[PDB]
Design a protein around this motif. Structure first.
Motif, PDB file in Angstrom:
ATOM      1  N   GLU A  21       0.828  -1.209   0.000  1.00  0.00           N
ATOM      2  CA  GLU A  21       0.000   0.000   0.000  1.00  0.00           C
ATOM      3  C   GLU A  21       0.865   1.263   0.000  1.00  0.00           C
ATOM      4  OE1 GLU A  21      -2.107   3.346   0.740  1.00  0.00           O
ATOM      5  OE2 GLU A  21      -1.011   2.637   2.513  1.00  0.00           O
ATOM      6  N   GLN A  22       1.904   1.296   0.830  1.00  0.00           N
ATOM      7  CA  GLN A  22       2.796   2.471   0.877  1.00  0.00           C
ATOM      8  C   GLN A  22       3.633   2.602  -0.412  1.00  0.00           C
ATOM      9  OE1 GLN A  22       6.106   3.458   3.800  1.00  0.00           O
ATOM     10  NE2 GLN A  22       7.208   1.744   2.892  1.00  0.00           N
TER      11      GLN A  22
ATOM     12  N   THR B 247       1.192   4.280  -2.820  1.00  0.00           N
ATOM     13  CA  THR B 247       0.987   5.675  -2.473  1.00  0.00           C
ATOM     14  C   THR B 247       2.169   6.536  -2.969  1.00  0.00           C
ATOM     15  OG1 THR B 247      -0.370   5.058  -0.543  1.00  0.00           O
ATOM     16  CG2 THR B 247       0.447   7.289  -0.597  1.00  0.00           C
TER      17      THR B 247
ATOM     18  N   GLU C  59      -7.852   6.069  -8.841  1.00  0.00           N
ATOM     19  CA  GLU C  59      -6.874   5.625  -7.849  1.00  0.00           C
ATOM     20  C   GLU C  59      -7.248   4.246  -7.311  1.00  0.00           C
ATOM     21  OE1 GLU C  59      -6.675   7.987  -4.318  1.00  0.00           O
ATOM     22  OE2 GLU C  59      -4.867   6.981  -3.612  1.00  0.00           O
TER      23      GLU C  59
END
Lengths: 14, 105
Positions: free
Chosen positions: A5-6, A9, B31
């Protein structure tokens, strides 16, 4: 090794 | 064509994503779409490796690869599919360019 997830991002803002 | 691009190094780590085409496509939720698509691409296919692993192994040996369609679910319950093609490029270090193509039908 899948992206966390990071990881995503960071890629999506850079 | 609704799509996005990735670049991976030769370990398979994603080092950039280009969402310009998705952002020009006039729909909200891109997204969530990109995250969900990537996660689906990287998910084990039953007993078989994920399409991400299959394409990585193939592209590093033979220079090109392609996945069949795989499905994923947006936050609102919307079902989409995508498939992925990639290419080993020798420019710098060599990198893997991937295009991820969305089917909304």
């Amino acid at each position: 090794l899948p992206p966390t997830e990071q990881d995503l991002t960071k890629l999506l803002l850079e | 064509v609704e799509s996005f691009m990735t670049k991976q190094d030769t370990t398979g780590k994603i080092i950039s994503i280009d969402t310009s085409s998705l952002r020009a496509a006039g729909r909200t939720g891109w997204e969530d779409l990109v995250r969900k698509c990537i996660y689906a691409f990287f998910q084990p296919q039953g007993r078989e490796p994920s399409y991400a692993r299959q394409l990585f192994q193939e592209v590093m040996t033979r220079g090109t690869a392609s996945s069949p369609s795989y499905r994923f679910i947006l936050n609102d319950g919307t079902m989409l599919s995508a498939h992925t093609r990639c290419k080993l490029c020798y420019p710098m270090q060599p990198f893997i360019m991937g295009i991820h193509i969305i089917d909304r039908e």
